[PDB]
């Protein structure tokens, strides 16, 4: 796969979270390199997920978790049609990941993938290699989330959709 060409996608900054526990799904549509996770909304423009201290990623293509530009063997390789569940817990400050409704296990964290996840302004985010494609589901159609009920709702996570609407704009 191309090892140089990537684009990173993040939800609008007005939609960032600073509390609670949040969930979204990420459907694999191509077989090339992709990463999904959570980012500080003010992460430096153009940064890939996990490349610095401002975002955390599961690289289901390489089977690695990525943070501060260091990769670690983690999880299972995903496949076209898989659905990744993406967890953010700003109460305990952890990140987790499921694959088709089953939590991916970290050798140390077990059901938790990253700890000490701190920040003010988290948004869902992904990084796609050239030609790669994925579908992000936030729950606006509660029936469109596939694995939230059996893998997430029980642990008190909430669909991320609730965090998009409403704005004071101020030209200062």
XYZ file of N, CA, C and O in Angstrom:
688
model
N 0.839 -1.200 0.000
C 0.000 0.000 0.000
C 0.871 1.246 0.000
O 2.011 1.195 0.439
N 0.335 2.355 -0.509
C 1.078 3.608 -0.516
C 1.369 4.023 0.919
O 0.464 4.054 1.759
N 2.635 4.320 1.208
C 3.077 4.581 2.571
C 3.267 6.062 2.841
O 3.871 6.436 3.852
N 2.755 6.914 1.966
C 3.042 8.337 2.056
C 1.774 9.183 1.949
O 1.687 10.244 2.577
N 0.785 8.724 1.176
C -0.386 9.522 0.829
C -1.535 9.196 1.778
O -2.065 8.078 1.759
N -1.937 10.185 2.587
C -3.005 10.031 3.563
C -3.800 11.325 3.680
O -3.280 12.405 3.410
N -5.073 11.201 4.079
C -5.876 12.335 4.509
C -6.599 11.992 5.806
O -7.114 10.885 5.968
N -6.666 12.961 6.713
C -7.270 12.765 8.022
C -8.556 13.569 8.114
O -8.610 14.720 7.670
N -9.593 12.936 8.656
C -10.928 13.512 8.751
C -11.307 13.621 10.220
O -11.087 12.686 10.991
N -11.837 14.773 10.611
C -12.290 15.007 11.974
C -13.627 15.728 11.949
O -13.890 16.539 11.063
N -14.439 15.470 12.963
C -15.695 16.184 13.138
C -15.453 17.627 13.580
O -14.436 17.950 14.200
N -16.415 18.501 13.257
C -16.270 19.931 13.523
C -15.910 20.192 14.983
O -16.307 19.455 15.890
N -15.164 21.277 15.211
C -14.727 21.609 16.563
C -15.897 21.945 17.478
O -15.824 21.711 18.690
N -16.975 22.505 16.931
C -18.133 22.823 17.756
C -18.733 21.578 18.388
O -19.538 21.692 19.317
N -18.334 20.393 17.935
C -18.922 19.140 18.375
C -18.045 18.404 19.376
O -18.355 17.262 19.728
N -16.973 19.039 19.856
C -16.016 18.392 20.747
C -16.628 18.124 22.125
O -17.599 18.764 22.544
N -16.034 17.161 22.839
C -16.512 16.755 24.156
C -15.394 16.912 25.175
O -14.209 16.724 24.877
N -15.794 17.256 26.404
C -14.874 17.418 27.520
C -15.325 16.623 28.738
O -14.760 16.794 29.827
N -16.321 15.756 28.582
C -16.821 14.924 29.663
C -17.645 13.802 29.054
O -17.885 13.768 27.845
N -18.077 12.878 29.911
C -18.913 11.773 29.479
C -18.140 10.636 28.807
O -16.908 10.618 28.725
N -18.911 9.659 28.334
C -18.405 8.464 27.665
C -19.159 8.306 26.352
O -20.397 8.333 26.342
N -18.416 8.122 25.252
C -18.955 8.300 23.907
C -18.568 7.146 22.990
O -17.518 6.517 23.148
N -19.423 6.901 22.007
C -19.309 5.741 21.136
C -19.701 6.127 19.717
O -20.640 6.908 19.516
N -18.960 5.604 18.740
C -19.349 5.698 17.337
C -18.816 4.467 16.624
O -17.953 3.761 17.145
N -19.341 4.203 15.429
C -18.917 3.034 14.679
C -18.260 3.468 13.375
O -18.494 4.566 12.861
N -17.423 2.584 12.857
C -16.503 2.887 11.768
C -16.463 1.638 10.901
O -15.890 0.609 11.297
N -17.115 1.692 9.742
C -17.245 0.527 8.879
C -16.157 0.517 7.811
O -15.968 1.507 7.096
N -15.474 -0.615 7.697
C -14.392 -0.805 6.739
C -14.985 -1.043 5.357
O -15.780 -1.971 5.162
N -14.589 -0.231 4.382
C -15.108 -0.383 3.029
C -14.035 -0.682 1.993
O -14.377 -1.005 0.853
N -12.761 -0.584 2.347
C -11.668 -0.927 1.453
C -10.635 -1.694 2.260
O -10.700 -1.751 3.491
N -9.666 -2.281 1.563
C -8.726 -3.204 2.196
C -7.357 -2.579 2.443
O -6.420 -3.287 2.826
N -7.213 -1.280 2.213
C -5.946 -0.609 2.375
C -5.775 0.023 3.745
O -6.521 -0.248 4.685
N -4.762 0.870 3.886
C -4.405 1.365 5.221
C -5.393 2.414 5.718
O -5.695 3.382 5.020
N -5.897 2.207 6.934
C -6.801 3.153 7.586
C -6.608 3.062 9.094
O -6.170 2.029 9.608
N -6.955 4.152 9.785
C -6.873 4.287 11.237
C -8.106 5.026 11.738
O -8.620 5.926 11.067
N -8.559 4.674 12.939
C -9.723 5.319 13.534
C -9.485 5.510 15.025
O -8.842 4.691 15.687
N -10.035 6.596 15.556
C -9.921 6.855 16.978
C -10.504 8.202 17.345
O -11.549 8.596 16.818
N -9.809 8.923 18.225
C -10.273 10.184 18.788
C -9.133 11.184 18.749
O -7.976 10.817 18.961
N -9.461 12.441 18.489
C -8.459 13.487 18.383
C -8.893 14.720 19.163
O -10.087 15.044 19.220
N -7.916 15.393 19.774
C -8.111 16.783 20.152
C -8.501 17.572 18.914
O -7.854 17.453 17.870
N -9.544 18.402 19.038
C -10.039 19.141 17.879
C -8.999 20.119 17.339
O -8.959 20.372 16.128
N -8.161 20.687 18.203
C -7.093 21.567 17.758
C -5.791 20.821 17.468
O -4.722 21.441 17.455
N -5.848 19.516 17.236
C -4.658 18.809 16.788
C -4.088 19.521 15.567
O -4.852 20.029 14.741
N -2.770 19.546 15.397
C -2.164 20.285 14.275
C -2.752 19.852 12.942
O -2.928 18.655 12.686
N -3.065 20.795 12.056
C -3.682 20.413 10.780
C -2.798 19.453 9.993
O -1.576 19.602 9.950
N -3.432 18.460 9.361
C -2.727 17.499 8.533
C -2.118 16.328 9.270
O -1.685 15.367 8.626
N -2.066 16.370 10.592
C -1.498 15.266 11.348
C -2.331 14.011 11.157
O -3.560 14.058 11.197
N -1.656 12.887 10.935
C -2.305 11.587 10.948
C -2.650 11.174 12.373
O -2.001 11.595 13.336
N -3.652 10.299 12.502
C -4.042 9.833 13.826
C -2.911 9.064 14.490
O -2.196 8.282 13.853
N -2.764 9.298 15.789
C -1.737 8.668 16.564
C -0.348 9.183 16.312
O 0.571 8.746 17.000
N -0.161 10.108 15.367
C 1.178 10.586 15.024
C 1.790 11.497 16.085
O 3.017 11.642 16.123
N 0.989 12.127 16.936
C 1.530 12.961 18.006
C 0.781 12.629 19.295
O 0.150 11.573 19.439
N 0.877 13.524 20.271
C 0.264 13.307 21.573
C -1.190 13.738 21.620
O -1.824 13.629 22.679
N -1.732 14.207 20.499
C -3.065 14.777 20.437
C -4.108 13.839 19.828
O -5.264 14.241 19.680
N -3.749 12.616 19.456
C -4.788 11.707 18.990
C -4.322 10.276 19.171
O -3.126 9.996 19.261
N -5.302 9.376 19.246
C -5.094 7.969 19.552
C -5.786 7.149 18.482
O -6.905 7.475 18.079
N -5.147 6.081 18.030
C -5.684 5.387 16.871
C -5.519 3.879 17.000
O -4.563 3.382 17.615
N -6.490 3.171 16.422
C -6.394 1.750 16.113
C -6.163 1.623 14.609
O -6.972 2.110 13.815
N -5.045 1.011 14.225
C -4.686 0.791 12.818
C -5.036 -0.663 12.517
O -4.203 -1.569 12.631
N -6.290 -0.893 12.144
C -6.735 -2.240 11.863
C -6.097 -2.865 10.647
O -6.210 -4.081 10.478
N -5.433 -2.074 9.800
C -4.749 -2.631 8.635
C -3.431 -3.273 9.038
O -3.126 -4.397 8.624
N -2.631 -2.553 9.822
C -1.369 -3.038 10.360
C -1.540 -3.777 11.678
O -0.567 -4.334 12.194
N -2.747 -3.799 12.237
C -2.985 -4.479 13.505
C -2.173 -3.836 14.627
O -1.467 -4.510 15.379
N -2.265 -2.510 14.731
C -1.470 -1.777 15.703
C -2.292 -0.649 16.318
O -3.192 -0.094 15.681
N -1.977 -0.327 17.570
C -2.447 0.901 18.187
C -1.317 1.920 18.130
O -0.144 1.552 18.217
N -1.667 3.194 17.934
C -0.701 4.238 17.603
C -0.965 5.454 18.479
O -2.100 5.937 18.560
N 0.085 5.953 19.116
C -0.005 7.152 19.928
C 1.401 7.711 20.052
O 2.373 6.954 20.110
N 1.496 9.039 20.075
C 2.770 9.754 20.007
C 3.713 9.086 19.012
O 4.894 8.874 19.305
N 3.201 8.737 17.835
C 4.053 8.315 16.723
C 4.831 7.039 17.028
O 5.909 6.809 16.473
N 4.304 6.202 17.908
C 4.862 4.886 18.171
C 3.742 3.867 18.050
O 2.628 4.101 18.530
N 4.032 2.760 17.381
C 3.047 1.734 17.095
C 3.277 0.544 18.007
O 4.416 0.215 18.352
N 2.184 -0.099 18.401
C 2.254 -1.300 19.214
C 1.289 -2.323 18.654
O 0.155 -1.992 18.301
N 1.759 -3.559 18.563
C 0.918 -4.672 18.176
C -0.345 -4.696 19.026
O -0.281 -4.644 20.259
N -1.501 -4.746 18.370
C -2.742 -4.705 19.128
C -3.903 -5.112 18.240
O -3.930 -4.775 17.054
N -4.861 -5.812 18.836
C -6.110 -6.131 18.189
C -5.949 -7.157 17.080
O -4.967 -7.891 16.993
N -6.963 -7.200 16.223
C -6.997 -8.102 15.085
C -7.053 -7.290 13.803
O -7.556 -6.161 13.790
N -6.536 -7.871 12.723
C -6.647 -7.224 11.428
C -8.108 -7.215 11.001
O -8.793 -8.239 11.061
N -8.596 -6.060 10.584
C -9.987 -6.020 10.175
C -10.099 -6.390 8.698
O -9.105 -6.549 7.992
N -11.333 -6.525 8.232
C -11.598 -6.911 6.859
C -12.759 -6.080 6.330
O -13.566 -5.551 7.097
N -12.842 -5.987 4.998
C -13.958 -5.295 4.358
C -15.271 -5.775 4.955
O -15.522 -6.980 5.050
N -16.113 -4.836 5.374
C -17.398 -5.152 5.945
C -17.414 -5.217 7.461
O -18.500 -5.214 8.056
N -16.250 -5.274 8.096
C -16.203 -5.236 9.551
C -16.714 -3.890 10.064
O -16.680 -2.874 9.361
N -17.198 -3.889 11.305
C -17.620 -2.666 11.988
C -16.825 -2.520 13.282
O -16.967 -3.333 14.208
N -16.009 -1.471 13.347
C -15.243 -1.138 14.544
C -16.105 -0.264 15.448
O -16.677 0.738 14.994
N -16.200 -0.638 16.720
C -16.799 0.226 17.724
C -15.684 1.008 18.386
O -14.660 0.436 18.781
N -15.873 2.323 18.501
C -14.830 3.246 18.954
C -15.300 3.940 20.231
O -16.256 4.728 20.193
N -14.613 3.681 21.351
C -15.026 4.147 22.671
C -14.106 5.257 23.171
O -12.884 5.166 23.036
N -14.700 6.280 23.792
C -13.972 7.304 24.547
C -14.627 7.472 25.908
O -15.825 7.767 25.987
N -13.841 7.320 26.972
C -14.290 7.454 28.359
C -13.519 8.596 29.008
O -12.414 8.392 29.520
N -14.104 9.797 28.996
C -13.461 10.933 29.647
C -13.721 10.956 31.147
O -13.258 11.874 31.833
N -14.426 9.963 31.677
C -14.524 9.832 33.126
C -13.270 9.173 33.679
O -12.575 9.759 34.515
N -12.949 7.962 33.204
C -11.710 7.276 33.570
C -10.542 7.630 32.653
O -9.411 7.213 32.919
N -10.798 8.339 31.554
C -9.764 8.775 30.611
C -9.108 7.581 29.918
O -7.900 7.354 29.994
N -9.946 6.826 29.216
C -9.494 5.656 28.491
C -10.122 5.635 27.110
O -11.124 6.303 26.840
N -9.499 4.858 26.234
C -10.015 4.572 24.907
C -10.066 3.062 24.752
O -9.190 2.343 25.255
N -11.108 2.585 24.078
C -11.272 1.165 23.789
C -11.749 0.995 22.354
O -12.192 1.946 21.701
N -11.699 -0.245 21.880
C -12.115 -0.555 20.522
C -12.744 -1.935 20.487
O -12.211 -2.874 21.078
N -13.864 -2.054 19.781
C -14.443 -3.356 19.491
C -14.358 -3.638 18.004
O -14.166 -2.743 17.183
N -14.505 -4.915 17.677
C -14.521 -5.401 16.309
C -15.719 -6.328 16.199
O -15.767 -7.357 16.884
N -16.696 -5.946 15.380
C -17.930 -6.717 15.213
C -18.542 -7.090 16.563
O -18.931 -8.233 16.819
N -18.639 -6.100 17.438
C -19.315 -6.301 18.696
C -18.508 -7.015 19.751
O -19.045 -7.311 20.825
N -17.240 -7.309 19.492
C -16.382 -7.918 20.499
C -15.215 -6.990 20.789
O -14.527 -6.531 19.868
N -15.019 -6.697 22.068
C -13.953 -5.798 22.474
C -12.609 -6.404 22.117
O -12.357 -7.583 22.386
N -11.748 -5.599 21.501
C -10.390 -6.025 21.203
C -9.551 -5.933 22.477
O -9.609 -4.932 23.203
N -8.773 -6.972 22.756
C -8.079 -7.095 24.033
C -6.633 -6.635 23.908
O -5.903 -7.103 23.034
N -6.230 -5.723 24.788
C -4.849 -5.281 24.901
C -4.145 -6.123 25.960
O -4.750 -6.511 26.961
N -2.861 -6.410 25.725
C -2.146 -7.356 26.580
C -2.127 -6.889 28.023
O -2.203 -7.710 28.946
N -2.013 -5.578 28.242
C -2.033 -5.000 29.580
C -3.400 -4.438 29.952
O -3.938 -4.775 31.006
N -3.993 -3.605 29.091
C -5.284 -3.022 29.432
C -6.464 -3.979 29.346
O -7.556 -3.622 29.799
N -6.282 -5.166 28.781
C -7.438 -6.025 28.564
C -8.472 -5.296 27.708
O -8.201 -4.902 26.569
N -9.661 -5.061 28.264
C -10.736 -4.425 27.505
C -10.480 -2.954 27.208
O -11.194 -2.378 26.380
N -9.499 -2.344 27.866
C -9.097 -0.965 27.638
C -7.869 -0.926 26.730
O -6.914 -1.688 26.933
N -7.890 -0.036 25.732
C -6.783 0.045 24.782
C -5.730 1.078 25.175
O -4.530 0.794 25.074
N -6.162 2.277 25.577
C -5.297 3.362 26.021
C -5.824 3.913 27.336
O -7.041 4.019 27.522
N -4.916 4.298 28.222
C -5.253 5.020 29.448
C -4.492 6.339 29.468
O -3.670 6.623 28.594
N -4.786 7.155 30.476
C -4.227 8.499 30.576
C -4.553 9.333 29.334
O -3.729 10.124 28.873
N -5.765 9.158 28.798
C -6.251 9.935 27.651
C -6.881 11.222 28.186
O -8.020 11.226 28.662
N -6.145 12.329 28.095
C -6.552 13.603 28.682
C -6.838 14.636 27.602
O -6.225 14.608 26.530
N -7.749 15.561 27.890
C -7.961 16.679 26.984
C -9.334 17.302 27.120
O -10.226 16.781 27.795
N -9.497 18.427 26.399
C -10.593 19.386 26.548
C -11.650 19.298 25.455
O -12.757 19.819 25.642
N -11.319 18.696 24.315
C -11.989 18.993 23.059
C -11.858 17.825 22.087
O -11.360 17.996 20.968
N -12.301 16.641 22.505
C -12.187 15.434 21.692
C -13.270 15.356 20.624
O -14.441 15.647 20.886
N -12.875 14.923 19.427
C -13.803 14.628 18.337
C -13.483 13.275 17.707
O -12.325 12.838 17.723
N -14.456 12.578 17.131
C -14.125 11.354 16.410
C -13.289 11.704 15.191
O -13.405 12.794 14.632
N -12.420 10.778 14.788
C -11.507 11.104 13.697
C -10.978 9.823 13.077
O -10.947 8.767 13.714
N -10.548 9.932 11.825
C -9.945 8.793 11.154
C -8.911 9.300 10.168
O -8.886 10.485 9.827
N -8.037 8.389 9.728
C -7.039 8.669 8.699
C -7.126 7.581 7.634
O -7.061 6.393 7.968
N -7.278 7.980 6.362
C -7.430 7.045 5.245
C -6.287 7.193 4.254
O -5.994 8.302 3.802
N -5.657 6.076 3.902
C -4.745 6.081 2.774
C -5.460 6.413 1.476
O -6.683 6.327 1.363
N -4.681 6.811 0.467
C -5.292 7.145 -0.811
C -6.062 5.936 -1.327
O -5.635 4.781 -1.171
N -7.225 6.202 -1.915
C -8.132 5.173 -2.361
C -8.913 4.457 -1.274
O -9.685 3.546 -1.593
N -8.744 4.815 -0.004
C -9.423 4.056 1.040
C -10.759 4.711 1.393
O -10.984 5.902 1.149
N -11.661 3.911 1.962
C -13.010 4.402 2.219
C -13.581 3.752 3.471
O -13.299 2.588 3.769
N -14.370 4.520 4.212
C -14.975 4.027 5.443
C -16.250 4.815 5.706
O -16.437 5.910 5.172
N -17.132 4.238 6.522
C -18.396 4.866 6.883
C -18.454 5.014 8.398
O -18.324 4.016 9.119
N -18.662 6.254 8.867
C -18.793 6.590 10.287
C -20.259 6.764 10.661
O -20.989 7.527 10.015
N -20.675 6.074 11.716
C -22.056 6.072 12.187
C -22.120 6.589 13.619
O -21.497 6.016 14.523
N -22.899 7.647 13.832
C -22.926 8.339 15.114
C -24.193 8.089 15.909
O -24.285 8.526 17.062
N -25.168 7.413 15.327
C -26.354 7.044 16.045
C -27.565 7.925 15.841
O -28.580 7.697 16.510
N -27.501 8.924 14.954
C -28.679 9.761 14.741
C -29.880 8.900 14.384
O -31.003 9.168 14.824
N -29.660 7.844 13.607
C -30.635 6.772 13.457
C -30.196 5.675 14.420
O -29.327 4.859 14.096
N -30.791 5.673 15.616
C -30.434 4.707 16.655
C -30.383 3.287 16.106
O -29.573 2.466 16.557
N -31.231 2.974 15.123
C -31.262 1.638 14.539
C -30.096 1.359 13.598
O -29.929 0.207 13.176
N -29.303 2.372 13.242
C -28.176 2.176 12.335
C -26.891 1.784 13.051
O -25.988 1.230 12.411
N -26.773 2.069 14.347
C -25.674 1.512 15.122
C -25.849 -0.003 15.223
O -26.911 -0.497 15.607
N -24.817 -0.746 14.861
C -24.980 -2.190 14.767
C -24.693 -2.905 16.083
O -25.443 -3.810 16.462
N -23.623 -2.525 16.794
C -23.158 -3.274 17.964
C -23.217 -2.485 19.266
O -22.722 -2.965 20.292
N -23.813 -1.296 19.260
C -23.857 -0.475 20.467
C -24.649 -1.153 21.579
O -24.237 -1.124 22.746
N -25.793 -1.762 21.243
C -26.689 -2.304 22.267
C -25.997 -3.380 23.094
O -26.043 -3.357 24.335
N -25.370 -4.347 22.415
C -24.723 -5.473 23.079
C -23.273 -5.200 23.455
O -22.706 -5.960 24.242
N -22.648 -4.151 22.910
C -21.243 -3.865 23.225
C -21.040 -2.353 23.359
O -20.492 -1.690 22.472
N -21.468 -1.813 24.493
C -21.296 -0.402 24.751
C -22.366 0.206 25.630
O -22.059 0.842 26.646
N -23.626 0.044 25.232
C -24.712 0.641 25.998
C -24.692 0.159 27.440
O -24.978 0.931 28.357
N -24.331 -1.107 27.650
C -24.255 -1.704 28.982
C -23.218 -1.025 29.859
O -23.421 -0.917 31.074
N -22.109 -0.563 29.283
C -21.070 0.067 30.090
C -21.280 1.561 30.234
O -20.380 2.257 30.719
N -22.443 2.068 29.837
C -22.757 3.468 30.027
C -22.253 4.424 28.963
O -22.278 5.641 29.185
N -21.782 3.927 27.827
C -21.401 4.822 26.749
C -22.655 5.354 26.052
O -23.717 4.728 26.078
N -22.508 6.510 25.397
C -23.583 7.179 24.668
C -23.192 7.437 23.210
O -22.044 7.795 22.927
N -24.125 7.261 22.274
C -23.799 7.544 20.869
C -23.335 8.978 20.708
O -23.836 9.887 21.369
N -22.356 9.189 19.821
C -21.775 10.526 19.723
C -22.728 11.546 19.107
O -22.519 12.756 19.283
N -23.774 11.092 18.407
C -24.621 12.015 17.657
C -25.156 13.146 18.529
O -25.325 14.273 18.051
N -25.419 12.868 19.812
C -26.003 13.856 20.712
C -25.180 15.125 20.794
O -25.684 16.136 21.288
N -23.922 15.102 20.350
C -23.035 16.246 20.502
C -22.965 17.133 19.280
O -22.062 17.971 19.209
N -23.878 16.987 18.320
C -23.916 17.925 17.197
C -25.266 18.631 17.106
O -26.238 18.094 16.561
N -25.295 19.838 17.674
C -26.197 20.918 17.319
C -25.951 22.071 18.276
O -25.518 21.859 19.414
N -26.182 23.290 17.793
C -26.326 24.485 18.615
C -25.049 25.315 18.631
O -23.952 24.771 18.794
N -25.170 26.632 18.459
C -23.957 27.431 18.378
C -24.241 28.912 18.604
O -25.139 29.492 17.987
N -23.444 29.523 19.462
C -23.311 30.968 19.487
C -22.124 31.315 18.607
O -21.046 30.733 18.746
N -22.334 32.198 17.645
C -21.234 32.688 16.836
C -20.956 34.138 17.219
O -21.880 34.902 17.507
N -19.678 34.507 17.217
C -19.212 35.762 17.804
C -18.039 36.229 16.957
O -16.989 35.582 16.964
N -18.204 37.322 16.213
C -17.120 37.794 15.346
C -16.291 38.784 16.156
O -16.558 39.990 16.183
N -15.305 38.245 16.870
C -14.387 39.025 17.696
C -12.996 39.047 17.058
O -12.466 40.114 16.740
